[PDB]
Design a protein around this ligand. Structure first.
Ligand code: SF4
Ligand code: SF4
Ligand code: FES
Lengths: 52, 230
């Protein structure tokens, strides 16, 4: 349209990096339930005080 | 004269010939952990928390009830003593329920000021936790006998200073209990003065019961006047 290219003659032409993320391709939600790994020598039979 | 220089962590001190390892190590400004011991009581040893690794010996002894021979090296911090003070105070922290939101000695119990400094980090038990029942004795001693780590400290007090022969030990092995077999009340002089001696919060005060936690008070010393002895 004719109001479009006047934005494209002024200050270059971007058309994609809008100042809103309000449109699509903003991350909406995330589904899965989380579970945390328990790693750093939390286990037994060697993990043992007076060493740490 | 009448002394032995014992190198407590390699440092000389002269005690009487016939004192204890506990009083020797407490003389040089140290604390070994104390459960089955009291100065104002007799001496037993059935908690087995004080365990020091004596030098020139493969074994470990307990500092409560043994004399001191010719001058040893009482090796307090070792790489084996900390394999013992961690060791004993992992068992007795298992067969015990999850109180202290509601345990009324919740700011001063000796499973709570030993367990940060000494001892382990996590648990591996991982199910169990026997649960005995309680009773009532008098209208002064709020009574949860579940916690009751059986340090035999209230028990000897009946044979000690308060001469009322009332309490005993009922049971065998894992299952023993402390309270009176029959439902006889226990009240005389000094009868409310056991709830200081019980080193965990298994015994507490009946009127004081649910009021406030002990980190909010302001301790100011004074004298009571209700008797002539002060
Ligand atoms: S009242 Fe509990 S802590 Fe005190 S001596 Fe008896 S069993 Fe041990
Ligand atoms: S008496 Fe000791 S073990 Fe029992 S709830 Fe209080 S701190 Fe925990
Ligand atoms: S502290 Fe009483 S026996 Fe070790």
């Amino acid at each position: 349209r004719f109001i479009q290219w006047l934005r494209n003659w002024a200050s270059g032409r971007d058309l994609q990096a809008k100042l809103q993320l309000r449109y699509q391709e903003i991350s909406k939600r995330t589904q899965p339930p989380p579970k945390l790994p328990v790693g750093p020598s939390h286990k037994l039979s060697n993990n043992y005080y007076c060493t740490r | 004269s009448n002394l032995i220089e014992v190198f407590v962590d390699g440092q000389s001190v002269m005690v009487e010939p016939g004192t204890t390892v506990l009083q020797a190590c407490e003389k040089v400004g140290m604390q070994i952990p104390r459960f089955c011991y009291h100065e104002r009581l007799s001496v037993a040893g059935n908690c087995r928390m004080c365990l020091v690794e004596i030098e020139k010996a493969p074994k470990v002894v307990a500092a409560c009830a043994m004399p001191v021979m010719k001058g040893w090296n009482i090796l307090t911090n070792s790489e084996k003593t900390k394999k013992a003070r961690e060791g004993v105070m992992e068992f007795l922290l298992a067969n015990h329920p999850l109180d202290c939101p509601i345990c009324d000695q919740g700011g001063e119990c000796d499973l709570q000021d030993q367990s940060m400094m000494f001892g382990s980090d996590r648990s591996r038990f991982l199910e169990g936790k026997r649960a005995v029942e309680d009773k009532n004795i008098g209208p002064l001693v709020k009574t949860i006998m579940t916690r009751c780590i059986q340090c035999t400290r209230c028990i000897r007090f009946a044979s000690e200073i308060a001469g009322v022969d009332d309490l005993g030990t009922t049971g065998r092995g894992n299952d023993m209990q402390v309270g009176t077999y029959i439902e006889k009340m226990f009240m005389s002089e000094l009868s409310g003065n056991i709830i200081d001696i019980c080193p965990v919060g298994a015994l507490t005060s009946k009127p004081y019961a649910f009021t406030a936690r002990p980190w909010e008070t302001r301790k100011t010393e004074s004298i009571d006047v209700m008797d002539a002895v002060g």
